[PDB]
Design a protein around this ligand. Structure first.
Ligand SMILES: Nc1nc2c(ncn2[C@@H]2O[C@H](COP(=O)(O)OP(=O)(O)O)[C@@H](O)[C@H]2O)c(=O)[nH]1
Ligand SMILES: [Mg+2]
Length: 168
């Protein structure tokens, strides 16, 4: 049974928990404690392949978690999330990518840049800025809305496709 272990990272408030809950449970949760870190597993079909997703929704807290360490060590791909109406969260992306590179001791880790909250009209990070950053890292950029589901499967499934390419 094919399995893909994914990790969702990025600044507090960008929609990591809402994106993960949307993917797994097909609804938008508008309040979810920003300190809760949990994993979610689901059987899905991606490009006709039945597979298991095993996703860590990180929360950036200081307390030790053996599970968190395990997902960093064995996680196969990472979503790096910012919000398109939060310039600071976009400025914070580079730090998350640098951490992931250190965990893997590698420049080539399957990764997707995710610009969430694209349903909102107050866009302060434009598509070109994000596309240029993604191009600099050599990774895809996907715009998402956890509220409407726009791009949500694309973001996670694109990550799965990046993993598939890496495995070859
Ligand atoms: N409009 C909008 N609000 C969102 C979206 N995703 C998350 N939110 C809201 O943004 C806030 C932070 O979301 P949350 O999932 O807790 O973010 P996390 O701290 O990254 O886990 C909450 O108020 C969510 O309701 C989205 O796509 N659109
Ligand atoms: Mg959260």
């Amino acid at each position: 049974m094919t399995e893909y272990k994914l990790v969702v990272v990025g600044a507090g408030g960008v929609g990591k928990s809402a994106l993960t809950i949307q993917l797994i449970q097909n609804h938008f949760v508008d309040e979810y404690d920003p300190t809760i870190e949990d994993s979610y597993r689901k059987q899905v079909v991606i490009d006709g392949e039945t597979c298991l997703l095993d996703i860590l929704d990180t929360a950036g807290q200081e307390e030790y978690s053996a599970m968190r360490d395990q997902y960093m060590r064995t996680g196969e791909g990472f979503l790096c999330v910012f919000a398109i109406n939060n310039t600071k969260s976009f400025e914070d992306i580079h730090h998350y990518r640098e951490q992931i590179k250190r965990v893997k001791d590698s420049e080539d880790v399957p990764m997707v840049l995710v610009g969430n909250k694209c349903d909102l009209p107050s866009r302060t990070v434009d598509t070109k800025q994000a596309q240029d950053l993604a191009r600099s890292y050599g990774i895809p950029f996907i715009e998402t809305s956890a509220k409407t589901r726009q791009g949500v499967e694309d973001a996670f499934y694109t990550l799965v496709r990046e993993i598939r390419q890496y495995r070859l």
